[PDB]
Design a protein around this ligand. Sequence first.
Ligand SMILES: [Zn+2]
Ligand SMILES: [Zn+2]
Ligand SMILES: [Zn+2]
Ligand SMILES: [Zn+2]
Ligand SMILES: [Zn+2]
Ligand SMILES: [Zn+2]
Lengths: 264, 255, 262, 262, 262, 264
Amino acid sequence: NVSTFEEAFNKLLKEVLEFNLENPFEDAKKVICIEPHPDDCAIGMGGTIKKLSDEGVEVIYICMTDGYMGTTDEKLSGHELALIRRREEEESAKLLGVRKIYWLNYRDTELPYSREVRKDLVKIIRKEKPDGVFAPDPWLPYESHPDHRRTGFLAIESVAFSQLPNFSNIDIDIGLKPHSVSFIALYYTHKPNYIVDITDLMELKLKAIRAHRSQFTDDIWETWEPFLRTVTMFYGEKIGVRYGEGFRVMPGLFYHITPFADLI
Amino acid sequence: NKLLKEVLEFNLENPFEDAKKVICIEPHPDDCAIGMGGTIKKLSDEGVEVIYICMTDGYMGTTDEKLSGHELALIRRREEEESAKLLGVRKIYWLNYRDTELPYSREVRKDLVKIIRKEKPDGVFAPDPWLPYESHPDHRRTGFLAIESVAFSQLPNFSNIDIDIGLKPHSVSFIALYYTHKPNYIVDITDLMELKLKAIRAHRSQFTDDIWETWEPFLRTVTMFYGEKIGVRYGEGFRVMPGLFYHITPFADLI
Amino acid sequence: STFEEAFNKLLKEVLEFNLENPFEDAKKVICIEPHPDDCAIGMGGTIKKLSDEGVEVIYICMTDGYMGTTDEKLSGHELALIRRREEEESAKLLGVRKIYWLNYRDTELPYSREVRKDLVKIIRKEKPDGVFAPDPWLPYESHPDHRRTGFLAIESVAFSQLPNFSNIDIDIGLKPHSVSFIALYYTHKPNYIVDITDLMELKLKAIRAHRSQFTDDIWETWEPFLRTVTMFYGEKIGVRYGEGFRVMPGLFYHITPFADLI
Amino acid sequence: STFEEAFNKLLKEVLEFNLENPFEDAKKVICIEPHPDDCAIGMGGTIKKLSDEGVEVIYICMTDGYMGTTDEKLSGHELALIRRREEEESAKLLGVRKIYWLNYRDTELPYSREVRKDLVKIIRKEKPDGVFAPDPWLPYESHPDHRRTGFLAIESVAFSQLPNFSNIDIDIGLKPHSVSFIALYYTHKPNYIVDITDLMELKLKAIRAHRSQFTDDIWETWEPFLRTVTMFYGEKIGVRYGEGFRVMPGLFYHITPFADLI
Amino acid sequence: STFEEAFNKLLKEVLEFNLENPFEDAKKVICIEPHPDDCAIGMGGTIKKLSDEGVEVIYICMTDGYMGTTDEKLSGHELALIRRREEEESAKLLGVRKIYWLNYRDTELPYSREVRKDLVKIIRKEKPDGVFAPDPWLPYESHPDHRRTGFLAIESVAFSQLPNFSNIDIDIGLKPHSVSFIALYYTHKPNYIVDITDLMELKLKAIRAHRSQFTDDIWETWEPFLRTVTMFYGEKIGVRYGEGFRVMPGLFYHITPFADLI
Amino acid sequence: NVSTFEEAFNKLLKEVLEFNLENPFEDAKKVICIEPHPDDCAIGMGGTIKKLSDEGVEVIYICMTDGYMGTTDEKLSGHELALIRRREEEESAKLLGVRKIYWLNYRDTELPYSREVRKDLVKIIRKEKPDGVFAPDPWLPYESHPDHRRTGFLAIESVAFSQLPNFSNIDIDIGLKPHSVSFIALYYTHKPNYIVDITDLMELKLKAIRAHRSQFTDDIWETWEPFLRTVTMFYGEKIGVRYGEGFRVMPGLFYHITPFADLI
Ligand SMILES: [Zn+2]
Ligand SMILES: [Zn+2]
Ligand SMILES: [Zn+2]
Ligand SMILES: [Zn+2]
Ligand SMILES: [Zn+2]
Ligand SMILES: [Zn+2]
């Protein structure tokens, strides 16, 4: 029957998986957007958040850390630099129609890669019963920040595991029952397979990004707007527009032992 | 060139003939069967002693809240024993680390290296940890600890108390990586496809007709992806490089 | 206007960043090696041509090579001496006279904040103009020590700038340094090669000072291999024996979907 | 004014600390056992003296009891399950309904925050008025699970009351909870005893319910030990068989050079 | 001929030890504390009476105070900042200028080589004669950070003495430092008390500085405690108010079956 | 049963447990002495090990570490010292009848307290199947060395865990069968309940101790010798001898939930 692989491949995607990419969000009624440090949802996927906040979809944050380290000022202690930074995200979010932010409070550059941490995200997933999760892609070539790498990993890991009753069993017997999230979307990806048109809202994104004043001196912004405009244009060039934000959405089966998963 | 052919002397033609004993290492109950169940039968038919190592106890492989993890392990242990016999596998070592909680550490290496230094095997099988998009830590960590333990089992100063109780440094011939996206040698499983599925179905906890109805297309499609690459409809794939390509080699992928 | 014009302006005008001789400002750099000899077998030829031109080349050794033998009667400490001496038998013959030994047992190198806090000390100590390390992204690399060494180098360098990372090194006199560049060797993705056919002769020998590692019997498998690597590089820019490394602007190491375009 | 004086005028007067009846105004208590059986063996009798009197009793069980058999033929997985039944059994025979299974394997109970964060969760939900736990300062206690269980209770009772501790609990509608009294079983430093003479053959029956720990051949050694223990305790308050409990000021668990003085 | 005889001729001739006068050489000390306000509470007095004699007193605070509140409004990062402040207006009262902050979050001080590397650092630097730390064998002490600080401190002191321990301190010109003495506050077995009869008012003031901990409602419990503890130590030497320390020869800390006899 | 607790105490000890303390080392053919650092078995135990050769008991060491930190010598490295000390102990052990020494090779001062270690001891116990296991008391007031504390606990934990076929199963799976030790005995204790006379063996014990040259310069032997004699004196008085060695032996049942183990 199945002449070759590629004949069975396209049938496994349309018939079996109901896999689609012109509109993967669409039916989204609530999505948590996971970021390693505060400002990552902004820089990563700010426009697409506003878009999903103009469409009346509920956007919740989980911020892995407290950005305790993002300063060169030999006189501004991380403890407050972090106070400074929970304000700057409470600002940023307010702009983007992000209302809620869970704060995991793990110190910056010290985000563990453990089960403890997975018990945080799995806990939050069974409670906010989110339709999709927005996490950063960990297989981003040359990514050198452990927090980024680990975040996307736990993100996808906690996701697949939240369905699992015997995982963090203490959750089951206090009200929280397993939940099957609908889609996983990987911002900060070098292999996007769905770009959102953000050409328009590309001016509210920098005001959400810059809102983090602590992280953005005007002096350093002299290399970051030239930077951000370069990135967003690369996502746009894939679907012929001025600005773009890129995501990787794969079917749930391709996140595990799928040798051909690099074809979509 | 002069090295592939005339310094190390490796071949992508047939590597398994010289093997009389091999270890097939799997992260969970069934990965041997899903990853390589046909090549498994093959070797056992051809009269080769196939031994499993299971890293973990499955404990987490369910959505049925009535079912405790503890049982699932039991139930899956026997389900594996069914599956193993179905393929000619003789002994399964059970590491027993809890599912989704496989450590990446020396203790765990130290285990693998005990066994390797007892079965003194010619070939080991494992999941390719550089498999792109592998999202399951248990799997990544199995690949890595496998390739690691192997190499290390040769080094008398590693788990140095193993020696003092008999078990000597061994030196496996090959390492074979199933569940890989860079196979450089395939095997024909068109001969034994349906039996494989049967063995893969022996894990009833895992493959309800409902789930199996969704993984039925998957497991056939995969084995095609590999199969096509030779000239058959159904094949299991493998990355084999063994030697000095697993350590510092900027042209490793050219094979 | 387009993606390529914004790309080129980003590098040339916004971030400058060399590519034709990035060791032009160079005076003091560190070569971080997992085991003793990991500078040798990948960076050695490059190390003399820098000790020569004025650069005080500094070493950090991540491990102590404790595990590097087959000899079932050679204690792991015995080996660790053999290697250290053997290493000095190579430090010098390339023009390096300071080797920090971290001292962590071969095959037991932690990937922790702890180790980072060390590197950082040895980076806030010198204030080097550049650091070397193996590329942790070298495909199929199966030895944990290597992978970890790389990753920590990069993360440590970056982190040395932040006053809060190791907030005790500050308070005690050691202040943040902001390293100039980073270079990854042992890479299958170079972008700046370096000429070594002349000093290739010196290298052959410095990679033997570690003769516990490099015996006679084995060498008959490890020199054809060694020549091949030095071919793989060199012949892609001209000569018969060159060495190519990877170097990026500090900002391609974070959130850069277009990093591997170089 | 003396110290002897400035001691009494604190317990009765600054703490209202009564040792006559601490299990008095107690409408819900928690029983943390390191293994299925522990509660029964140190706690057993005393559970009944609370259970039936409208005091709701809940076990937390730290391990799966996976390493309690010297039987080649019994896998730890099967044993774990077996013990669920024996504990489900035993716990009716004492009027306990709810038991949380933490499922940290036998001999591998972590000493960490991650374990605290559980006990802390369960404690905030159930909002009990009392927590029972093994005295972790019991001389010669060899079993880590045992030691750790106590420390981990004491610590989770002090910290259930902290908003900034496990903040995600608050964010999901489980607010702080202060426990009135900590009572340590398996102590040798009691200061309140419990006469359980009529309930003894019941406790032994509730302990014996574990057919995997107390086989008839093991029962010839543990029955005399079980009895001796119970004799050790009660013989202090004039009664034959008793059970012992240490109870202190919440203040006395921290920084007190004289907390030994009760 | 006997034991009691061996006890003394060791103490007095060989180990030249005296309970008499231990602090009579003090030009530099370090007072280590679990939390911010810890050198206060149990040691505030002696410190001032040590500033007086021109002795430089340094603080090392192990935590950031992250978790000292019951009010879901006050957030740890801030609460920390509020506590970094309070111990400066408390340290000044007592001529304490230098305070090292390790920043380990409240209820999370690790027990590791790493945190030893830190205290051994600071100490190889400030090259002091005197280290103070809580008595990690203080009965019923139930705060992790408390226990872990004495052990770590002791271990740390004994551990500066060695070049191989943290040899990167060495390689950047920070040498072995032997310490003269060790004083364990918060002890139930002190053996050399000090006099704070007049100083018990600047005491409640230096402790008072920590108002985010000591609001005036909850002060009405610790008000009898802060005195009572100074009287426990008092009725031991004659004066009205005390601060006790255990001081033992560097030899008794290890393998000494009769440490309990001094 | 019987009436008073004291009566149940005896009855449990004499008849029920059948544990006594006249000469527990008697029926011992094989014993293992566990020491934190190389030289500890010498110091604490020395004499009683010479004695146990002088009868015909095979005596095995497990040395938890490698002494990698035992020097004030600004010049001398750990690596070589660890090499130096594998001799000093081989020398000092041949002067006592000591034939086998297991080197775990944990770095001095860095010995883990973890399953990984237990498994390491459990691998040896099971193999040599000894009747006797020796180790430091870990409840020793003021003992400030993590290795000495940890090594005691891990010993007790390891003796008991050897019996459990579910603990470290692969051992079983390769020959190594469960083993049950007749007794555990704690040196470096301060509640000993049995001494061994070593007065006429003392001098030799010192030769054994001082055979660790690196640890005892002439300058250091000036203080350690009175101390050492002082120690061995302390145990003396108890059995009315010049020099003693203390041990704590307790029934296996006392190491667990016994609120009166303080009483033997
Ligand atoms: Zn970030
Ligand atoms: Zn699997
Ligand atoms: Zn290497
Ligand atoms: Zn128990
Ligand atoms: Zn404190
Ligand atoms: Zn020692």
